[PDB]
Each structure stands twice: as C-alpha cells, then as structure tokens.
Amino acid sequence: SCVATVDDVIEQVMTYITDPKDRDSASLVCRRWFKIDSETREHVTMALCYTATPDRLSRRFPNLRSLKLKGKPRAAMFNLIPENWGGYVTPWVTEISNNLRQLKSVHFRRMIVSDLDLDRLAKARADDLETLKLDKCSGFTTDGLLSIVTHCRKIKTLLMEESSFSEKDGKWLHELAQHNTSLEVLNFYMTEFAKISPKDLETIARNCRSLVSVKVGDFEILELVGFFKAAANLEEFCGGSLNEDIGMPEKYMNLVFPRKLCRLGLSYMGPNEMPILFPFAAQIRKLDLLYALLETEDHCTLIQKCPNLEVLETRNVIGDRGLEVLAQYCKQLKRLRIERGADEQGMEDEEGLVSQRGLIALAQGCQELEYMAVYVSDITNESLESIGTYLKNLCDFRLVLLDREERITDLPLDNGVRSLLIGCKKLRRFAFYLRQGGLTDLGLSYIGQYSPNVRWMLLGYVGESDEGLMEFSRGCPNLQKLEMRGCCFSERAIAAAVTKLPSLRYLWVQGYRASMTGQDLMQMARPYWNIELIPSRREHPAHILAYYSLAGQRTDCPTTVRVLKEPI
C-alpha cells in the first residue's frame, strides 16, 4: 500500500461532474484526465453542425448517450435563410449507426432530415432510442415517422414541433396506439396534420400510463374529450382548436380537463370559451396564449386568476393594461415573452400596444424575472433604468421596437441601456433591435463595455458610424455568437471588429455597406475561419455568415451560396 493519489480515484469522481463547462476544464488538466472525460461524457451539443466532422465527434466521445445538433442559423426561423442552405443530417446518422453505439437520445434542431436517413436511424438504434426530437426540421415524410415508431418500440419522448414534412397518411400515429406503452412526452405543436385520427391519440392516452405532456395540431378540442378523460397523469397540453359556431353557445362548457394539468395553452381560444380554465387557474403555472384569439381586456381577467403563473407567452395584445395586471398578481413570474401580433389593421385593439408604461410597471411587480422578451411599440430611457434596477437575475433579455410608431418619446437610449446592463449582471443573452436614430456610437460602446457575461447578442439598428462598432469591439469579453441586421457598418469595419473580439466564433449579418470588390471582408481571414455569403428564401440583402470549424469548407453549399477563399 502506497499513498493514495488523485489518480487512484478520478475515474469514479469524474461521473459526479455534470456541468459541461467543468468537464470542459477537467479534460484539459492532463492526458489521463482527458481520456477519462472522453470515455464518460454522456451528452454533447453542437451549436453548428458544420463545426466539426462527425468522425471527430465519435472519436472524442465514443460513448455518448445523448446528442443535439443544430443546423441552420437562427435567422431561418424568420424565413430569412434559403431552404436548401444546409444542415443535412445524413453524415451524422451514418456516424451514429457505426460509432455511437450507445446513443439513446437524439435532438436535431433546424436541420434537414430525410426519409432515408431516419429509416437508417430507426433500424440502426431501434429499441434503444428512448428520445427523438425533430425540432423545426424539414425534408421528411410520414413514412419516416412510420419507420421510427415501428422499429423503436420503447420510445419515451417523440417531438416534431414546427417541422415541415409531407403527410401521406396517419399510420404512424395508429402504429403508436396499437403498440406503444412507454411514451412520456409527445409533441407535434406547430404542425399541419390532417390525416391522424383523434381516436388514435385517445387510445394512446389509455395505454401510456406515464404520459405527462402532449402538444397537438388543429384537432377539434371536442374530439379530444375521450383523450382528456383517459390522460390521467397529463401535466401539459398545448394545441388543439377552439371552433365556435353560434348554434352552440354552451359547446365547450362540459370539458373534463385532466386533474394534474398545470402547463397549457389552447389554440384559437376566444373570450366565450376562456371560462373553461377558471375552475383551476390557481393551479396553472405556464400559459401559451400565443395562438389565442382573445383581446386586451380578456387578458386581464384571466391573468388576474393565476397567482402562481411563472411562465407566460403571448402576443402584444396583452397591452400595457394587461402587463399592469400581471405586475401585482403574478409575483412568481420567471419567464415572459411578447411576440408581435397583427400589425396591419391598426393594432389588435386600441390598448394592444406595449410601452414604457407597462414595462416599468412590470419591472416593479415581477422581480423574479429570468427571461424577458418583448416586441414593444414605444420606450423611454427611464424604463430601461428600472429594468436593471429591480429584476437582477435577468439572464436573457430581448427588446425589439416596432417601426409602426412615428415619433418615439426620447430616442437615443444610450443611458438607459447603460444602467440596464449594469444592474443585470447575471445577463448572458441579450437582443436589442431598434430604429435608426436609436443608439449612438457612444451608447453602442457602452454595450461592449458593460456586458461581461453576455455570450450571445442580436443587435438591431444600433450605432451611427463604424466608430461605434470598433468601440464596441474592444469589449465583449465573453461574446461567442453575434447576429446583427439593419446596420450602417461597412465591410472593413466588420472585418476589423471581428479580429478585436476575443471570444467570437459565430457571426451572421444582413445589411452592411458592401463593395463590388468584396475584398474588404477578406481582412478577417484567419485559419479555421469559414465565411459564406447568401440571398434569401423561406428584396433580400446579402447575408454574411462566418464560423470557426476544424473541418474546412462544407461540400453541400447550394448554388445560391458563395464561399470566400482569398483572391477569387
């Protein structure tokens, strides 16, 4: 017996380190520690799939149990990125098929998944695949689905939210009904399915005792009563469809909602059907009024009933008035999102605008907020000051102001932004999209200067000249990903700022002072740094996308995409 070293005990200890950023470190302390991390890492996420070879991954982490790949850039979620752009998943499944023999969970996000490659997935992994997440993907069909539900008989979680595919039939759902037991979560939330029987969804609920969440297409809620009755342990339900004909004023007044149901959002819900929630609103903790059909008043009467609500997502109809209701009724709120509604026929009402008024009201009410994302119609430096004044543990903050309004109160926001970034020092993600005169080179340099923890930034029409970009660039200690559109910055301005940024690994840009040369961008050509240029699909300015990759340049570029490689 010699003295006991750390070496004699590290194999055991490693598996108690969960934090991805601590494994990141542990792997770098020496050769043995690196191997031990390598063989024990369970989950890995690639923010961009083109960032490394699928070979490189399987070599470094032979024993992955869970994997998550992202393809197309965030902009794709706004119909700004060509469909053919990339993110094909096939190289990765043929890698999983051969070298990740341990994988039980797969999550593809904004990628291209084909019928072939998921039949390949299905057959290669079979019963071992507990979870499959097709998050906002395209390129497959119900055949693909039918293939994974017949070969993976033990699927616990299955997800297709916002995916676009070709619907040929419904035998995929029916096959779940007839044979699946293990299902825990089932999600096809933003999806046009027109050939699936609700009877099948009902028989699934009857068979999967562990069924906890389910989100759904445009099913008629009435056809789901059989479901709801059988879905005992159900905690979350988003989706469905509330269709009111006048011939039944009391159509939806006999709804038996599962007892445990505490996270939800019915689609198309009007004021007439809204009442069906009251009998248990004290219990609701998450609300998705995103696709609800109710007006600024109706919002207030409902929010008012949910004191324990800690997450709300809704359109800007919520109104300043609504936000005020939310300010002293739901103190427990942690996440709030306000996507922009119909900005065509006026607003959705005459209170359906949000402004400094509601903002500052909210800042005082819910000081527990950790994520706040708002499409606002008018602001004030003062409002921002109160943000960074009350809700300290804001982690994700996103603000976008609509061009709808003509004159906005006080416009240059330099000093508001400043106290915000200074109070919310827990901030890690930050989005700030304005109108032209919105922020000055001085205010911009504030951002670089007072955002030490921010790793992602989306920036609107900020700055006035290349001065503000360069000033900004000497800051941002931890900035990794940077997206900016609608900017007055020049090609050589960008290029020079990228070199000054210490942490930057991903950059997307739409709108910038170009040049026929194109050679201005070149002055940022590091090694391992790929740059690409784009048009747009679903008058579109050229996009710039650049990212680090230990792979080299992708083979799969569309024709519509150009890769820069020094003097052409």
């Binding site: 902009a75 979620m77 706004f78 119909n79 700004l80 916002e162 933003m190 445009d218 995103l290 696709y291 059909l293 359109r315 996507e339 922009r340 509604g341 119909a342 976008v400 609509l402 061009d403 559109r485 609608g486 739409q510 709108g511 679903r538 008058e539 300015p541």
Partner: peptide, 18 residues
Amino acid sequence: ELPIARRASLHRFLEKRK
C-alpha cells in the same frame, strides 16, 4: 428598407386567423 421579419410560427397563425 429592412422590414421586421415575423417569426414563422406566428406568421402562419396570423393567416389562419383571417
């Protein structure tokens, strides 16, 4: 002229509205 791009999920819903 860079128009505020609408998140696809909503854009789809706003038309299923009318």
